[PDB]
Design an enzyme around this catalytic site. Sequence first.
Site, short mmCIF file in Angstrom:
data_model
loop_
_atom_site.label_atom_id
_atom_site.label_comp_id
_atom_site.label_asym_id
_atom_site.label_seq_id
_atom_site.Cartn_x
_atom_site.Cartn_y
_atom_site.Cartn_z
CE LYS A 1 39.42 39.21 29.85
NZ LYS A 1 39.03 37.96 30.55
CB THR A 2 34.95 36.68 33.06
OG1 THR A 2 36.32 37.10 33.19
CG2 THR A 2 34.79 35.28 33.64
CG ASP B 1 40.32 35.48 29.06
OD1 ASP B 1 40.46 36.57 28.45
OD2 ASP B 1 39.91 35.40 30.24
CD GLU B 2 43.24 39.13 29.61
OE1 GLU B 2 44.24 39.85 29.39
OE2 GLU B 2 42.16 39.57 30.06
CD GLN C 1 43.02 46.26 28.99
OE1 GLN C 1 42.66 46.77 30.05
NE2 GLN C 1 42.16 45.68 28.16
NE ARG D 1 42.15 48.09 35.36
CZ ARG D 1 42.21 47.87 34.05
NH1 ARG D 1 43.38 47.88 33.43
NH2 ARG D 1 41.10 47.64 33.36
#
Lengths: 642, 642
Positions: free
Chosen positions: A34-35, A219-220, A250, A601
């Site tokens: 996503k970055t 973001d987030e 998340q 993860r």
Amino acid sequence: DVSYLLDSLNDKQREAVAAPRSNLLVLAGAGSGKTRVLVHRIAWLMSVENCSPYSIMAVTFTNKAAAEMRHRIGQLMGTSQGGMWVGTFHGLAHRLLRAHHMDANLPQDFQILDSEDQLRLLKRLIKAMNLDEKQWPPRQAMWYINSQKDEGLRPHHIQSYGNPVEQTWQKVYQAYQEACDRAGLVDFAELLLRAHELWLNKPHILQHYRERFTNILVDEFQDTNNIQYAWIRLLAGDTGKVMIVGDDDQSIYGWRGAQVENIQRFLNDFPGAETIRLEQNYRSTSNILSAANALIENNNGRLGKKLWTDGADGEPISLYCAFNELDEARFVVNRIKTWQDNGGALAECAILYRSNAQSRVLEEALLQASMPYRIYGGMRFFERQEIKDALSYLRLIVNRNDDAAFERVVNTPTRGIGDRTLDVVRQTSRDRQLTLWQACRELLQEKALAGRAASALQRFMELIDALAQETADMPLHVQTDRVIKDSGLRTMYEQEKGEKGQTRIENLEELVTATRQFSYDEDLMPLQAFLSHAALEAGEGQADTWQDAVQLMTLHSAKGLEFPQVFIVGMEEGMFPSQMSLDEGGRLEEERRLAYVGVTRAMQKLTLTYAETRRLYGKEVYHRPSRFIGELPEECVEEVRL
Amino acid sequence: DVSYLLDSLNDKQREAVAAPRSNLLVLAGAGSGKTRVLVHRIAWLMSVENCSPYSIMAVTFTNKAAAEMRHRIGQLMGTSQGGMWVGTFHGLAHRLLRAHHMDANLPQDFQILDSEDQLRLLKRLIKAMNLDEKQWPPRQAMWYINSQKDEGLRPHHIQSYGNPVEQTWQKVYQAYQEACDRAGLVDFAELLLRAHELWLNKPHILQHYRERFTNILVDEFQDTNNIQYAWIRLLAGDTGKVMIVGDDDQSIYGWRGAQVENIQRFLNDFPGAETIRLEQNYRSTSNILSAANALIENNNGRLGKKLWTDGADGEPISLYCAFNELDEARFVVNRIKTWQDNGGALAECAILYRSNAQSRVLEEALLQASMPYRIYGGMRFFERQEIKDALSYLRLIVNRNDDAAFERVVNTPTRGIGDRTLDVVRQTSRDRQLTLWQACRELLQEKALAGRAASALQRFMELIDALAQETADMPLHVQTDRVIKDSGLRTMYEQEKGEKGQTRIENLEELVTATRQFSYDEDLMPLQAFLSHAALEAGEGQADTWQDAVQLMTLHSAKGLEFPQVFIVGMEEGMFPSQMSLDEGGRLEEERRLAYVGVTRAMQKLTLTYAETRRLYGKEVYHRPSRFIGELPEECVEEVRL
DNA sequence: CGAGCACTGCACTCGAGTGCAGTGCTCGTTGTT
DNA sequence: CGAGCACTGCACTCGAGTGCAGTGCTCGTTGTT
């Protein structure tokens, strides 16, 4: 135009990057990089849709991410992009507040009250009134207030009563804003509120910035709170457009006040808004990606998403069940020690826990087998006491009203100034609504203090004015080395313990090194700049000489990470899901989202464990395996009758 | 009836003793036998006129006198004579006050205030307002106060305001009275005044006394002040027949309040009051009387008399003009050294001086020749510091308001009740108008005193209360022995230098013996009794082993004495008449009278000397002979060129 | 269980009070109750 | 000459305030800025 920008993406992502200018969402996956999509969306707004870097504005939560952001933008758009704003909600609100300090009613040199400071200034105030003894601990007071600022509620806002249970607090809050004002200090949670408040009292400004930043990123987004959302909404009333990444699954920061809702709240409060589901993982195996979906689907009200790989399916998710954690660990050590024996790089792992307390027994097993490691426990540089002592004097220099700096270093190094004395300055400070240094100017003129006291107390105040002067026209790293000496802190620390103090001094001198390498258009003096750089980000803990070693850490502090091998210890009803959450709050879905984060993860293998018995501090105890292990597609998992 | 109260008298004395009940004035002239007359008259008053020992009141001035008076009357009246009031003014005064304390507005336990007591109490007062700084000297304040009561004034009497000088004192006198009133203290002057006032205030008592004491007799009448005169007049309405005795020419106590005029004032206030002169002297030679009559005739306003004798003319009065006083003394000693060689007794020789300063030079001379001698000045037992000390604790036990007793033993032995602490207690007393013990109860209660201060102050107080308690049932002497011990006084003096220290414990022991032989007759409680007889008569010096010695004293304390041989010294203008008496207020005639008193003290030989030069504190001075030497008829003086 | 922090003995500092010697400056009398 | 006498000038006592090291006794998520 041509596109060397997109050719590196995949339709989905590519679709987002090339998306038309307008509001939208980019429901990121977990191996969907996503970055990247963000790094390119700006490459696009400036290249293709041709917008000025002065209209773009990224916003992150961490300084690290928002910094690595600024990086890639610069590696893509070969150069530096002036005018752009890539920061944290905090640093950016700061940026504004320092600029329009006047408008918002703040001295240009206000100070950021960090965690510890805020808590202390609270413990101090609670006492100037009621009786804290469990009746009104300082922490809950801290909480109640932040909880309020997270909601944009000043004292004279939340009306109630019939229940002083609340009113009591309501009063403390009042004082806090009062005390913090006179002192000219503000807390992390304050920046945001104070800023947003500016855009409701200085409209012509609110315009100015919308009138500029017509493009916004965030973001987030699953971790924003009600005052953050409410801030942004305004930046883009209509004129501005805005992309927003995120992922409701998340959002493990709900207790920190993260409205997992907001993600949706956006789609509505903003009529025209599309949606993209990057659902392609490049981090973990398919076997794993599966376990995730089922597990994560046990929740509801979701937006739903299928996580699919295009790589292998990889090994199963072995499951252990030790008698006690002594084994649970010993097991993992061997399971990792084998990975190493086979050209395994011990940094490609990560024991993950639900509670920091679980880490102790892990370390002994490790150390009991010549195997390095490193926890990610907090305690970042700028938080260490010896340093806050140092910076406390500096604050007193930039301002003698830093109630926090004062009550900290006033009699440290101990200069014969006890509490009996301080308690007077307080009851003075309190009853006459003054900062402490103000009550001192008074209690000395009024000559209402002991000979001993006043003479010492005064000896102190002169030491400060002395340093402000003696060092004024100085360069940071020199002014610093001075204050460190001239306040006798160095001295105070050269006389400290064995293993202990030995570092204290070193950390201090690094404080100088650091200061000699601090860098920053002019709109604040090199100190006030530093003192802000100090509050808004600490970071550091001794980046262990890479000598390959394990990676221990809770799950919350693992979001955004990935490791070939990964584990989750304490997979049992009690810890995971937590006790204080299987009953205490009904926030049960969070605990699930976490496990979801914890699994998204692994990269190759993934091991889940748990013991029949374990001593949760003090007494013996036996739980029952996590309700989480069951909700797993059983074909993925694999017992290990070891 | 027969007479043997007469056959021993001389024609003139008889004329007085057998006089008829009426008011008369026996003008006795030294060597006259005035004591004999007073004694026989009284026996006559009872024997011949059949008056009752209850109608007779003989008033003397010194306890010594009264005592002697009493002894002799019982030697003629071979018995007791109960009912007769024979005593000194103060004595009698006091007797009344105790008997009628109620109507006198006084606690039945009032305490007499002696000179030191009085003077110090003032020092505190003046200081508790004003600046003693030679502008308002305590001595001067005291002097004014008694000069006031000798005259029977009172604060709210001699009104003024036309000069603060008499106004400040006026105020001081005011403060002093309330202080004494609040403390149950009466001073010697108060004793008399009060007693007078009582008779003006409660006429039904005066009556009782007039009705009773129909026979007054007053000795040394020329020494009476106004208040005394007045007191005598009332008890002698129109019904009382009073006989006074004295000599206006022997009035040497003017400076101390005596009114020589009162002698003639008696002749006016009671007409038909005849006068009888006792002029036949039995003490000295005709030559001496001779000079006497001449010397004294230089004063004017006297009733005049002629001292004559039926004896030898005797050697003349000799004169010696010493080079300096060092020589004058030597001279005198030699002359004495002969007398003794010729079998004379040293005790029959007396050197007399105007000032006490004049004795050292003589004592030395006397020493130098192994000539034993005793000096009639003297510290008196009940004045010694270790005795007032002891008595002060006893006082505090009778009454906690003895501001004088208080202020004395409070911090002695030192107890920590330092000075600073007292100025508080002192003031507190002033502002709030309370006794020192009172002002303490409060400062301690209101908790307005420091920890230390308060604690010590308390310690002292409980002690007094302790002694009071533990002593209530003890016979006077036991009680005294314990208070001396337990007040820490003994240990204090047991550890004092060596000279003083030794005598001191011994005196303190004498005190216990004293309190043991003390005898009084239901009227007052022993302790209160003693404390009284301790203030009304202090007698004792060191009753020197009757080892033949030369007699040294001042002309003043020489009055009423007689010696075969006398030597008056420093008859130098300036010395005698004293310089003070040349300017200070035409008190010359008194100084002459003094001289007259001296000459008439010799029996056989009178020697007069005077130096040409003498050292007078620091410097050497040169005076001219006293004019007095001149005034002596030449026929009676014979130079003495050594 | 270890972590943290009132929470409490206990040695010390320190200065207001104590207690008593030092210093500088008069200016002088008589003495009972 | 020296006694009396404010003062000033120590040395000392002593208790209020510090300065810390040492025993317990409560209570336990997660953690950026």
